Amino acid sequence: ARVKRGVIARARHKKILKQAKGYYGARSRVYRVAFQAVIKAGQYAYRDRRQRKRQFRQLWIARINAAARQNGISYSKFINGLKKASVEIDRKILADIAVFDKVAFTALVEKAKAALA
Template sequence: MPRVKRGVTARARHKKILKLAKGYYGARSRVYRVAKQAVIKAGQYAYRDRKQRKRQFRALWIVRINAAARLYGISYSRLINGLTKA
């Protein structure tokens, strides 16, 4: 049975990671080991922040709606309560 040679696969994997790390500072964009860690961490941050972005926008919308509602002498909570009852 011939031995398995993985040079082509390894190079492809390294290229993929380094491509994802393009634009990172210093070794993070040049050294495979460091770049791999940076890419993994970036993915974790991206996943977390996609969830947080939705929360932040909701909070922003609530602040804006509350400000507009108070111009008419009603609070956000009373406005939403009235809308759910309607």
């Protein structure tokens, strides 16, 4: 029996083109271009799921450094003091506190100053 090979290929092509919506020019219309673009976008998504937690750690550190500098202590000394104070707040919460409640942040800095002596 004869098997027409278009139908499965067409269905596979449609899926790629559906995933390439929003891309520029031929990358959103032409399968030969869309397929490579869709695959590459997956590689970046896999790559940038790791960079994401890197970039947010930079952001958390940068804000904690700024807020800590606002209270007369560098980021390096602030973290060291917090560890000596048995404080287990991570950078994500520290950046959340630094921006939303600067009074609670000063309490942490004062507590960090204490553990340093």
